[PDB]
Design a protein around this nucleic acid. Structure first.
Lengths: 328, 219, 594
DNA sequence: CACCCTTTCATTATTATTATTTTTTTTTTTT
């Protein structure tokens, strides 16, 4: 079954990309050598196929959140909001390797390849949390297919499909936000501001001569330490953008869909970014469609009461021995 | 019937290490169909050979399915995907204090273990996937109707099928021979791009225990 | 045809597949996008869909333009299933005439046949009228077409059945009595304007059922524009000023209206320096005039002006300015650029629907912009493969030569283009239609071809409508001369250039032996909804709408199978250039050869 | 032997990076 979550990000979206990306102070991405450049960590973008323009397919950039970030965000909000209060109201104590299997997609319960009988495969895929992702040494296929957060954008019209043409963006969706770090010893005003420093004026002066000597030595080398004074750039996806999120479940139970629904009920407090200091990735949910039928309201989720009762009786009955038996 | 199948993609897919065989796709689809039609507690070894394809027998044993590998026509340049894995250390610390986590170690390790940060890069291709096989078109359509993803059943969003199409074609056009074959295959079936190696020719192509001495084509 | 639909045997064999999945996916409750060409007989297939839905017990509503109405009820008379369940029609106030005003005009203009027709009940005189009166089993008196047949030159806007006509004139309780036609029959025909007006009547809280179980729309490409026609309320100033003489605040509204080539396009309230106090004075000076003693036809003008002003006042609507083709009269519009709410309020009121048109789909099986214009829900959308038969592209010959000058509204382009029209008209063995998108370039072509061609030419202008030009085209094709037609506007979409003098033998059809497209129709759709949709989509929506307009332009050549020796000409030099934006325009020209 | 610390070893080497160029029509038959 399918759940499509249409959200708008209250704050910008930043999911950092690999590679060495350089921007000038004006904005030119990846300059030829021989000119001053700048460190830049762009948001994650894939080259996707485009039937826009002509009937032939052209490769266009599309700035997304990766699906792994979506999967881990959904996982972590189910653990932080419903799973952990249930397991600490009972007194359950997880183990590393079972906590690592539940909270991450890792096999450190036993690094060995654990054999999995088909009956135990069935009894762990029907678990309200465990069967969604799986993981661990069993390496069994989880039931939850979490897609990338795709912005409603004309470069993604092949990914988005028909029906999103209304309320659709176009053009550039990335803004290169420039950030910086200043050496705060240079910000020190007088004796009242410096009295908390051990050494005070002497220590502040010593750091100023150390930074000065390091900077002049680096500039003389230009014609290996590093100071605090930084100024860098990062591309973010623009705030207020609308995004679709596809969550397709491969033969789910009622309790698993109820767990995903209670994740969507409480995911307003979650963030989706590499900008947690800057409150990046705050979003509100505008629509949640189950099997094509919208279910989201302003006061949380209204509908799917069978899923809510199923997940209530699922999270009530868990005693974390199933997590330990899932790990080893 | 000697037909030929294209799949076009609404999402970019993982470029396969070695060959994406069509019979592997149909076997996984039949496993999913058997999971729908029986339940969850079944053996995937039982039903992933129940395919509407022909079965070619080499002259002295070593039988394979009559289904060539997926040839790739790149609509897009072959880009790369990065993914990372790490357990959130901050929630681990708060769970260690709250008693929900029982961790004797007072320090993580990003180079190894449960809190290992791992980075890994896989090729990404957006392509038309064309295979050639002998079999019944209706059963291939019934299998491929459930085929929402191909190349990776990643559960993370890759390889989403925009559509599929099966058409019958003549005998001399179809290169079925472009497939992992046994070394005792017929002299008309061995081509120049085939070479002798260790490869699976049947069923689970990831299972290295079933890998045999095979003559196979290069993607 | 085992287990066939009702009326299937009269449908052609090529349209049988579209009909079967259209009935199947309307049986599932989805809104069906069914596409076929012009001469494939979509009326018979629509009749089969309406009958097969009508035998299920469904209240079936067929929405179509009034020209398509007669052949649609012609396909709905002889099959026994709609004979059992009944067929009726829903018609509005503009389908009728005022009897007192038409009699007073007939006495004044000394029309004996019209006056003798009105005296006696206004009994039907055209075969269509009495035959529809037999099919509905409700007598259709006072028809505008029946009065028009006796006098072609009557003021149809002046003699029209208004809402302010008295209750004792016969046409008004005729229309009131008919308004309940949907109760007594299982299939109800309506216009797109009827369906949109009744949808507005649903949304503001009679003539159509509250829930339509099965809706078939004929020529669905027009239907959204009909909604765009319905939700514009326009204030006409010069008829108001002539009516009041028979206030100074509306003259000050004109003076402040003057200060605001784009005059305030897509601006609901962006600039209102004196627009809203002037509108309030207009409303108060128009609504407080005494109803006693003021004329029965004047109150219609006063009421439509006050309704348009009250639509203007809310601020939920856009404002647009236009002037009449006759003179620079004051025309003002309060229209709606967003139309998701009302049409969505129609789609929850529709169980299943089949939208049939001649240009419904964009490229192959893409119709995404189509469900964007009509705001069709994606869950209820159903995209069927289209029918594009070979005989639509078989007799037509595409010529390699063209006009080397690019169309840039220049006189040198007009001279080179007109020399190519002279070449085509010299090689024409019949009629020729040369299609333009503007008045200025067609007056340039008229000034370049006037002394060259003489009596062979027909021009369209502000004083020359499409119907007059079309009638002259039949007239001088009847005389044996070979006409050329500098056509624009409605000459692109929706004219029947297949002759009715030879029904049975289409191989001798030479009424239109040459279609020449002088320029690519870019920038044709200027409506509020298309401007808003373009602002979202971008260049692509402009290109695809130009593709649909050009497909409707090329559809004028073949209207029925069996024709021969058809010539198609494209003189736009951008088509044969290396530009990529004319890429779809080439692939449709890739469907013709040599 | 399950839970961790902290030691240890390894040989070559270079660096490129997709982004756009409308026309201005007057239709239609609603309240």
């Amino acid at each position: 079954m399918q759940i499509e979550v249409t959200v708008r990000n209250i704050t910008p979206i930043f999911s950092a990309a690999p590679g060495s990306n350089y921007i000038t102070i004006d904005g030119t991405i990846n300059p030829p050598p021989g000119v001053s450049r700048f460190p830049l960590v762009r948001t994650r973008m894939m080259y996707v196929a485009a039937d826009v323009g002509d009937g032939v397919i052209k490769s266009v950039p599309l700035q997304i959140v990766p699906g792994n970030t979506m999967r881990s965000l959904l996982r972590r909000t189910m653990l932080k909001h419903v799973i952990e209060p249930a397991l600490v109201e009972k007194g359950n104590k997880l183990s590393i390797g079972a906590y690592a299997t539940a909270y991450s997609g890792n096999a450190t319960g036993n690094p060995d390849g654990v054999p999995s009988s088909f009956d135990e495969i069935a009894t762990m895929r029907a678990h309200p949390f465990i069967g969604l992702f799986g993981g661990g040494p069993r390496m069994l296929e989880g039931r939850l297919m979490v897609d990338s957060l795709y912005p409603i954008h004309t470069n993604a019209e092949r990914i988005l499909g028909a029906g999103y043409e209304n309320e659709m963006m176009s053009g550039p969706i990335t803004q290169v936000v420039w950030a910086r770090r200043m050496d705060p010893i240079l910000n020190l005003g007088s004796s009242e501001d410096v009295e908390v420093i051990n050494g005070g004026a002497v220590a502040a002066n010593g750091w100023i001569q150390d930074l000065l000597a390091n900077s002049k030595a680096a500039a003389s080398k230009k014609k290996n330490g590093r100071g605090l004074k930084a100024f860098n750039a990062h591309e973010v996806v623009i705030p207020g953008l609308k995004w679709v999120w596809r969550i397709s479940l491969d033969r789910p139970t009622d309790a698993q869909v109820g767990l995903v629904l209670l994740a969507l009920n409480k995911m307003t407090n979650e963030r989706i970014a590499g900008g947690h200091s800057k409150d990046y990735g705050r979003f509100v949910i505008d629509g949640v469609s189950l099997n094509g039928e919208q279910v989201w309201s302003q006061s949380g989720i209204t509908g799917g009461e069978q899923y809510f009762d199923a997940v209530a009786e699922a999270i009530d009955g868990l005693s974390s021995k199933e997590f330990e038996q899932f790990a080893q | 019937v000697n037909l030929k199948v294209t799949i076009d993609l609404s999402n970019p897919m993982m470029e396969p290490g070695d060959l994406l065989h069509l019979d592997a796709l149909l076997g996984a689809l039949r496993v999913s169909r058997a999971r729908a039609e029986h339940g969850d507690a079944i053996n995937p070894r039982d039903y992933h050979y129940d395919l509407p394809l022909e079965r070619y027998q080499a002259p002295s044993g070593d039988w394979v399915f009559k289904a060539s590998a997926f040839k790739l026509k790149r609509q897009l340049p072959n880009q790369m995907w990065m993914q990372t894995g790490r357990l959130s250390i901050v929630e681990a610390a708060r769970h260690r204090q709250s008693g929900y986590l029982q961790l004797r170690a007072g320090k993580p390790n990003p180079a190894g273990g449960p809190f290992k940060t791992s980075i890994y890069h896989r090729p990404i291709v957006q392509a038309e996937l064309t295979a050639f096989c002998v079999g019944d078109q209706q059963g291939i359509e019934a299998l491929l109707s459930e085929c929402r993803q191909i190349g990776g059943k990643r559960g993370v969003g890759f390889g989403q099928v925009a559509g599929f199409k099966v058409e019958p074609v003549a005998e001399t056009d179809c290169p079925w021979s472009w497939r992992a074959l046994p070394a005792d295959a017929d002299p008309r079936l061995v081509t120049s791009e085939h070479a002798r190696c260790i490869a699976a020719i049947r069923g689970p192509y990831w299972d290295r225990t079933l890998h045999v001495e095979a003559l196979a084509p290069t993607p | 045809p085992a287990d066939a639909l009702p009326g299937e045997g009269a449908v052609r064999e090529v349209l049988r597949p579209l009909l079967k999945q259209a009935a199947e996916k309307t049986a599932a409750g989805k809104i069906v996008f069914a596409e076929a060409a012009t001469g494939t007989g979509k009326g018979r297939m629509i009749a089969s869909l309406a009958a097969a839905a009508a035998i299920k017990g469904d209240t079936v509503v067929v929405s179509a333009p009034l020209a398509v109405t007669w052949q649609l009820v012609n396909d709905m008379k002889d099959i026994p299933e709609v004979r059992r369940v009944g067929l009726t029609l829903s018609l509005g106030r503009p389908n009728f005439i005022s009897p007192q005003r038409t009699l007073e005009w007939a006495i004044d203009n000394e029309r004996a046949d019209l006056a003798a027709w009105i005296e006696g009940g206004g009994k039907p005189l055209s075969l269509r009228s009495m035959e529809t009166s037999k099919v509905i089993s409700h007598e259709l008196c006072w028809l505008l077409e029946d009065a028009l047949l006796l006098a072609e030159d009557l003021p149809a806007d002046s003699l029209l059945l208004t809402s302010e006509d008295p209750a004792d004139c016969p046409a008004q309780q005729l229309y009131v009595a008919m308004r309940s036609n949907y109760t007594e029959a299982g299939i109800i025909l309506c216009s797109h304007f009827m369906l949109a007006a009744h949808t507005r009547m649903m949304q503001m809280r009679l003539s159509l059922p509250h829930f339509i179980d099965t809706l078939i729309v004929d020529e669905a490409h027009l239907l959204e524009q009909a909604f765009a026609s319905v939700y514009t309320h326009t204030l006409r100033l010069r008829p108001l000023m002539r009516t009041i003489e028979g206030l100074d605040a509306l003259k000050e509204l004109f003076t402040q209206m003057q200060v605001a080539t784009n005059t305030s396009l897509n601006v609901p309230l962006s600039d209102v320096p004196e627009l809203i106090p002037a509108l309030k004075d207009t409303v108060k000076t128009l609504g407080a005039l005494p109803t006693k003693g003021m004329s029965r036809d004047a109150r219609s003008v006063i009421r439509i002006a006050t309704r348009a002003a009250n639509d203007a006042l809310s601020g939920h609507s856009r404002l647009r300015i236009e002037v009449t083709p006759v003179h620079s009269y004051p025309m003002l519009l309060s229209g709606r650029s967003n139309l998701q709410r009302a049409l969505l309020g129609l789609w929850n009121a529709t169980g299943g629907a089949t939208l049939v048109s001649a240009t419904l789909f964009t490229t192959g099986d893409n119709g995404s912009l189509t469900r964007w214009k009509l705001e069709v829900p994606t869950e209820r959308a159903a995209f069927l493969p289209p029918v594009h038969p070979a005989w639509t592209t078989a007799p037509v010959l595409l010529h390699k030569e063209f006009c080397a000058h690019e169309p840039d509204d220049s006189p040198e382009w007009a001279t080179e283009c007109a020399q190519t029209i002279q070449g085509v008209a010299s090689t024409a063995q019949g009629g020729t239609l040369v299609l333009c998108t503007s008045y200025q370039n067609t007056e340039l072509l008229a000034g370049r071809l006037g002394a060259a061609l003489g009596d062979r030419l027909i021009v369209q202008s502000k004083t020359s409508s499409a119907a007059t030009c079309l009638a002259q085209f039949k007239a001088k094709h009847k005389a044996g001369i070979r006409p050329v037609w500098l056509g624009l506007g409605a000459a692109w979409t929706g004219i029947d250039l297949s002759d009715h003098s030879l029904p049975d033998n289409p191989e001798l059809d030479r009424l239109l032996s040459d279609l020449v497209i002088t320029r690519i129709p870019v920038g044709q759709n200027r409506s509020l909804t298309h401007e808003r949709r373009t602002a979202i989509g971008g260049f692509r929506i402009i290109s695809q709408e130009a593709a649909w307009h050009f497909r409707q332009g090329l559809g004028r050549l073949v209207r029925r199978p069996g024709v021969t020796h058809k010539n198609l000409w494209v003189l736009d030099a951008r088509i044969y250039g290396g530009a990529a934006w004319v890429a779809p325009f080439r692939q449709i020209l890739d469907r013709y050869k040599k």
